[PDB]
Each structure stands twice: as structure tokens, then as C-alpha cells.
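Bench log. Compound arrived from synthesis this morning; before running ITC I wanted a structural hypothesis for how 4ZI sits in the protein. Inputs:
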Amino acid sequence: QCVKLNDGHFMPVLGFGTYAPPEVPRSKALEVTKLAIEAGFRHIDSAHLYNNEEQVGLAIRSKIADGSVKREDIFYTSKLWSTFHRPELVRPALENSLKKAQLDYVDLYLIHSPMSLKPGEELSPTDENGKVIFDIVDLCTTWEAMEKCKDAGLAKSIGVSNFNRRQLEMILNKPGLKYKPVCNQVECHPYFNRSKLLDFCKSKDIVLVAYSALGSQRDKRWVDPNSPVLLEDPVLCALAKKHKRTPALIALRYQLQRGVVVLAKSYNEQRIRQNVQVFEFQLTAEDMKAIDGLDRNLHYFNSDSFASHPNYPY
Ligand SMILES: NC(=O)c1ccc[n+]([C@@H]2O[C@H](COP(=O)([O-])OP(=O)(O)OC[C@H]3O[C@@H](n4cnc5c(N)ncnc54)[C@H](OP(=O)(O)O)[C@@H]3O)[C@@H](O)[C@H]2O)c1
Ligand SMILES: COc1cccc(NC(=O)c2ccccc2OCc2c(C)noc2C)c1
């Protein structure tokens, strides 16, 4: 069950989110990625930021060795972190990711964020006052380096993440653009449904990939605890009983029926296996409008620190 991208490649519409907080041991990412493939996941979403690409790569490698899957069956995504936006840093960053995951190519390589940060191996460079150090980079030059990564065959497709309409247009209107972004991976859920950005992306044949589709991990570092818990929403819960499903399954099915590729993170075997049941049932057009009405313009990631960044997408 895939969507054809604007470069001709195919992307499975349900993806496994691999991020876990640093308090979760790295061995779990290896275990649960195997479980995800066992359950039927084929789209696997990782990033240099996540400090798990070696474990995710080991799991893919293990499921190829036991004959469960072939490399051609797995859609693996990595992401260029914001400290490597400068063009000369892009290809070595991808090559590092490939070496850690022990893969010859990624199916998808993304610009993780438009907010460039100070170049270096430090993921969160902070000044003497503990403030994240920004960098200024022409993201069109970053994209040019991404296009060369596709030409070199190190990435089958290239796309962006956390871009707004204006930043997307910056790429689409770039003189001599060779490859359009195949996708824009953004926070998207019934409380933040991105209908405006989704309509724009559809008009440009760019796939919207939804993260925090299940309402985020509510990490204490970025999520206000008083924010609403998505999966406790009464409309989601009432729809779950109607269909004899779970609120999470409603949230995932919501995205599939509106043309959105949806990610789902779980480090729990039974919830991993439950999430692939999204293909078993179907919401009515009335159910969809009911979920459409839940929009709160609530993004679970906030930071007034990044609000000052020139490229802050919100
Ligand atoms: N490009 C970006 O900037 C960006 C940002 C954030 C995330 N992402 C990616 O998107 C992926 C998912 O987003 P997310 O990290 O915010 O997590 P999420 O998909 O919104 O899931 C949130 C929580 O829901 C739980 N869950 C999973 N299945 C469930 C089910 N059937 N019933 C009840 N609860 C369930 C999970 O807890 P359990 O683990 O206990 O099951 C999970 O922690 C991430 O892993 C990451 O790959 C990308
Ligand atoms: C070095 O640390 C940085 C620097 C910048 C941004 C972040 N972002 C986050 O911590 C984060 C945490 C949880 C969910 C989503 C998150 O960010 C999504 C996002 C948006 C929107 N724009 O860029 C990104 C990335 C972390």
C-alpha cells in the first residue's frame, strides 16, 4: 500500500517512527524495529539526530538475513541534521548515516528542519548563556547538495521536513531546480491537521508525511503537560467504539483517507502490531468531517527559543 512520488519512486503510506528519548536504551530500538518489520511495517523513519541509525540498520540487516524481507522491500528514511546545512557538509553527513546503518543507500533523505544551526559535530551547540547557536544558510544551496546525493545514487528520493509554504516555494521557484521535494514531513494530527499546507502540497504533488500523528511522546523537555492528550479526545474515543477500534487507529486512518502518509512510533510489541490494522477498516465521509472539526492549531513541539530563528516554520 504505497503512494507514487513525483520522482517515480513509491513510498508505503504507513511508516514506523523510531525516535525514543535518550533515556531509552539503544538496544530497544534494535528490538522494536525488528518487531515492526515482523508486524508488516516496511517504511522506517530514522535520522542522524535520533542516535539510533546503527540499531535500525542492524534490525533491517537481521530481517534480511533471516529471509523475512529484502532490501528492496524496505523504505528507509534518514534526515540531514541542521548542523550540516552548509552544502559541503551534506554528502559526508549522508555517507556517515549510511556507514552507521550499514546501508548502500537511503530510500529517502530529508532536510530535517529549515532552522540551520552552527556547523559541527555537536547536535545542540549552545553559547555561554545556554542558547542554541543559529547559523545562516541559503537552503537552496543545501537542496542543490541534496540533488547531487540523489544523482550519486546515495538517496533514491529527497524531500524536506518542517518546511512551511514560503520555504517550500523557495525550493520550487529555485532557478534550475532539478528535483522537487517528494515530501514534506511535518507535525500533523487531528489537533493540528495542516489542511492549508496539505492543499498546497497536493497542488504541487508533494506528499505530506505526518509525524506526532498519535499526539507525540509528550516529552517533558518540549511539551506542556497541560496540553490536551490527543488519544483521550472524546470524538476519537467515540469513533473507536463505533468501529470497534482504538483512538490511535482512528488517528492513523484519518490521515490515510485524506491523502497523508502517516508515521507511528511505538516501542510496545502489541501496539506496534495493532497499528498495522489501520488497513483493516474505513471511516465514513461523515467520520472524516467530525475529525476535521477537531483542529486546535496545537503543535506539541513548542519553543520560544526557536521562535527567534529566522527560519522558524510557525
Ligand atoms: N521530522 C521531525 O522533525 C520529526 C519530529 C518528531 C517525530 N518525527 C518522527 O515521527 C515519528 C512518530 O512521531 P512521535 O515521536 O511524536 O510519536 P507518535 O507517532 O505521535 O506516538 C505517540 C505515542 O503514542 C503511543 N502509541 C503508539 N501506538 C499506540 C497505540 N495503538 N495506542 C496507544 N498508544 C500508542 C506510543 O507510546 P508507546 O511507545 O508506549 O507505544 C507513542 O509514544 C517519530 O518517531 C519520528 O520518526 C519526526
Ligand atoms: C537541536 O535541537 C533542536 C533544534 C531545533 C528544533 C528541535 N526540535 C525538537 O526538539 C522537536 C522535538 C519534538 C518534536 C518535534 C521537534 O521539532 C520539530 C521541528 C520543527 C517544527 N522545526 O524543526 C524541527 C526539528 C530541536
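What the model suggests: The chain has one domain: 1-314. Residues 17-19, 45, 112, 161-162, 185, 211-217, 231, 246, 248, 263-268, 271, 274-275 surround NAP (ligand 1) (CB under 6 Å).
ITC booked for Thursday regardless.
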